[PDB]
Design a protein around this nucleic acid. Structure first.
Lengths: 66, 121, 177, 114, 79, 60
RNA sequence: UCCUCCUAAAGAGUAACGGAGGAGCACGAAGGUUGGCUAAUCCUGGUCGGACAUCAGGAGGUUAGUGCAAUGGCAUAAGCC
RNA sequence: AUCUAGA
RNA sequence: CCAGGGCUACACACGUGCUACAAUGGCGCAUACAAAGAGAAGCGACCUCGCGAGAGCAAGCGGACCUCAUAAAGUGCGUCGUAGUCCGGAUUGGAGUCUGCAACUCGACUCCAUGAAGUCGGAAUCGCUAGUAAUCGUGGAUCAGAAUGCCACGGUGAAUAC
RNA sequence: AGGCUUGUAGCUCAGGUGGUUAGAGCGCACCCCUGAUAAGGGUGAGGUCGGUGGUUCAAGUCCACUCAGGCCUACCA
């Protein structure tokens, strides 16, 4: 890099509520709060629920019952 | 194809207002059989309708379906411009002229042309 | 950084087991990342690209170049030499750290998220995606800014074709629906 | 304060602030703050993260900002593909619920342009 | 939105479906019943519902189940 | 030359139809038709008007 | 009046109210020197972004550029910084 | 400013 | 005579209205103060269940006694601080409940999500002189269901006329 | 025949010189005034700038090419 034209690149500490700390280098400022990350996020259960939504005859069966 | 052309007759305001309502009648007829109707010219009346409205109708055998409407059309009603409420009798007149396309107006054939070259004066 | 130190041992070996290279230098390795932001609306608002470049300086690490119209076009009212889009070709250590900060805290914060696509390969082994907003990066307050501004990350890898480059990123557990 | 997409209020009381999420209005917000147990007239400025973690999973129970758009659009796109009455109304932008269409309907049928 | 106890049909439609179970396939079964819901066992059939002047034949499918028949026979014909 | 022959004199001496709104009646003078329609004429639907004239025109 | 091509017949020159086009300037840098660089146009992928803005790669190899008319040239570059 | 033509 | 459809269609125009554009307001809680009516192949307590429309058993009453029927604007206390917003409620998606043989065209009503046009309105334009205008709720006829209309009733309650 | 000059909204004209943006009067459509029309008042749409091809980053404009209209010249014999 060059000098005195680039911004700061302080190594700060990350934090999500999940319990997954990985300290990383940027110019956020002081601290890093998160709620989701590469883990503790529905990348693998939210990519399962959006597909299966159809199905209608068993709805009609949930109103006769006999 | 044909030229449907409705001129208003006696009763120059009321039958203008009625020639509006013959033009809407064949207008409603040509749309039924899917024919193109197009108002080529329209002299409007005073209180609605037209003193003459010449409108080309193209389509599929327009002339043989509509050649019988040429003539007068006498209209017994209470008018719109009638403040005493009695019957008035008017008339509209329609013509229907056929398509009749064009051919080349001169035949410039110089074998018909006697060319007479003489001295100038 | 840390997934470069995961690269050099487990992703190199992770691909040496898969596409059975008789050499090692035949493994792909990600060359660079070129964050573009083609702001465009510097023709009408000249001081827009000040902050539109100041965004890339805070998203990425370093100071951006502000690039110019190659040949002038009258479809968009730009004369040749007009500053129309700011870019950063980061490489080296900062590319592993921006990529590591990409798949950890930047990818999962995308609103209405499906998973990144896999057809975003150019048929060469180079992945190129586009992001809509700024706020998948924590450096943006969401309160300090006012613009709907977004960029489009271009991952450049030295693979021969994209059958290989999809394996290189998917060995980094890259999303790929 | 980033639940289910964005959620950025400013000095607004908590039940009014949680309305901002697509998929919860006034009632379901009181179901959140009833279940997750936060007082109603506290503010998301005051509401610290050790309180919010009880809400990022609590609004996550009912379908919210993300998955509800493709729930709803999935049902609409279903109706258009049926070719029933109502999908034949969604194709055109005429009112589905049997309104007047002679005179009114400028919500469903757009502005009064022609 | 309708009739919480008993999804509604008519006997002249329903027994016609019952005979359409063992009849195999048929030409469209001329029914004027619109107020009846479609039972799930009618899939594969092609009953024709009266819109008011003509019977439009409609193929009962897994998507088109709990809806009534008159959903799928538009009466008024516009432009 | 032809339009003058077809477009009549304009005056009300009956020339090839009437349109009688108080009685509701329509009479085309030829094939002295006596249709009482006048709402089935004033939106097209003069099929019954024209058709006996073309029949009694293919009569000759 | 002047410049460029063709007529002009493989040196030069060569007419016509022969065929085609430009000039009556610009530039203190668009001059010098050193150092660096290489296009046009398509295809693939990509935020609004679009056939046509910026990005990355590939094809292509001067079809580009040359302050302005045409010819002659020009990568050692005379083109770009 | 004008308001045709059927007591 | 019969079944299905239609009178509810929708490029648009006109008439009357209802809800609004908000802070003399919205929302949450506590609370006060009426008139006029209707009721038996009717009104329907009480108690329970349901988030809510409502569902179960059901006392009374052809009624100054029983039922609809908690009147609301009001007052007190918070709250939101001028934002297309805790304004506004269309439009839509899903699940409901009633009546009726039947709720698709085409019923009303509830719950949850939805949250658009709209920031007092051009030229013109209408009603209104006092318990009037304005505003607030309630009842009846028609009627199985189905009014923002009609017909009636009370609450608060003005400025103005030279 | 050449020489000079028009062509822009449905009509009549600016806009063209000065290359990056299309306006005016009347007409037309919609709503008021009116017993109803005209007048009037309020609101609105309406153009690829005669067709063809170059230059240019871009053509309504700038150069050729025409097409339809107009004026002038066409003499000495």
């Amino acid at each position: 890099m060059k000098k005195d034209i680039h911004p700061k690149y302080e190594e700060i500490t990350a934090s999500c509520s999940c319990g997954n700390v990985m300290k990383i280098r940027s110019t956020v400022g002081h601290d890093l709060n998160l709620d989701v990350c590469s883990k503790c996020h529905p990348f693998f259960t939210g990519k399962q629920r959006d597909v299966a939504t159809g199905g209608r005859v068993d709805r009609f069966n949930k109103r006769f019952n006999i | 194809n044909a030229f449907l052309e409705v001129r208003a007759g006696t009763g120059g305001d009321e039958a203008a207002l009625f020639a509006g309502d013959l033009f809407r009648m064949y207008s409603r007829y040509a749309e039924a059989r899917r024919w193109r109707v197009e108002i080529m010219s329209a002299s409007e009346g005073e209180h609605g309708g037209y003193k003459e409205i010449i409108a080309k109708i193209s389509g599929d055998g327009v002339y043989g379906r509509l050649k019988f409407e040429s003539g007068g059309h006498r209209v017994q009603r209470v008018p719109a411009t009638e403040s005493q409420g009695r019957i008035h009798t008017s008339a509209c007149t329609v013509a229907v002229m056929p398509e009749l396309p064009d051919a080349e107006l001169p035949d410039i054939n110089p074998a018909d042309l006697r060319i007479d070259t003489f001295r100038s004066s | 950084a840390k997934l470069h130190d995961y690269y050099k041992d487990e992703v190199v070996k992770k691909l040496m087991t898969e596409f059975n290279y008789n050499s090692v230098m035949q493994v792909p390795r990600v060359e660079k990342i070129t964050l573009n932001m083609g702001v465009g609306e510097a023709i009408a608002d000249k001081k827009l690209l000040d902050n539109a470049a100041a965004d890339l300086a805070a998203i990425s690490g370093q100071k951006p170049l502000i690039t110019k119209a190659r040949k002038s076009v009258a479809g968009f009212k730009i004369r040749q030499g007009y500053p129309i889009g700011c870019k950063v070709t980061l490489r080296g250590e900062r590319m592993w750290e921006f990529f590591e900060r990409l798949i950890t805290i930047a990818v999962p914060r995308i609103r209405d998220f499906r998973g990144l696509s896999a057809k975003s390969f150019d048929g060469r082994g180079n992945y190129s995606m586009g992001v809509r907003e700024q706020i998948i990066f924590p450096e943006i307050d969401y309160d300090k800014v006012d613009r709907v501004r977004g960029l489009d990350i271009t991952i450049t890898t030295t693979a021969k074709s994209d059958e290989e480059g999809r394996a290189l990123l998917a060995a980094f557990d890259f999303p790929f629906r | 304060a980033r639940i289910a997409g964005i959620n950025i209020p400013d000095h607004k009381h908590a039940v009014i602030a949680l309305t901002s999420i697509y998929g919860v209005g006034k009632t379901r917000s009181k179901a959140i703050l009833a279940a997750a147990g936060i007082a109603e007239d506290v503010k998301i400025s005051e509401l610290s993260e050790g309180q919010i973690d009880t809400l990022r999973d609590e609004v996550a129970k009912f379908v919210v900002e993300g998955d509800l758009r493709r729930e709803i659009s999935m049902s609409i796109k279903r109706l258009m593909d049926l070719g029933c009455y109502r999908g034949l109304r969604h194709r055109r932008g005429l009112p589905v619920r049997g309104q007047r269409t002679k005179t009114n309907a400028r919500t469903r049928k757009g502005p009064r342009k022609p | 939105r309708s009739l919480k106890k008993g999804p509604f049909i008519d006997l002249h439609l329903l027994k016609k479906v019952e005979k359409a179970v063992e009849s195999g396939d048929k030409k469209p079964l001329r029914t004027w019943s619109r107020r009846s819901t479609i039972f799930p066992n009618m899939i594969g059939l092609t009953i024709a519902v009266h819109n008011g002047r003509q019977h439009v034949p409609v193929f009962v499918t897994d998507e088109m189940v709990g809806h009534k028949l008159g959903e799928f026979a538009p009466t008024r014909t516009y432009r | 030359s032809t339009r003058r022959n077809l477009l009549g004199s304009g005056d009300r001496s009956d020339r090839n139809r009437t349109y009688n709104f108080p009685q509701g009646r329509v009479t085309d003078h030829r094939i002295n038709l006596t249709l009482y329609r006048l709402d089935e004429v004033m939106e097209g639907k003069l099929d019954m008007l024209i058709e006996p004239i073309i029949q009694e025109h293919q009569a000759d």
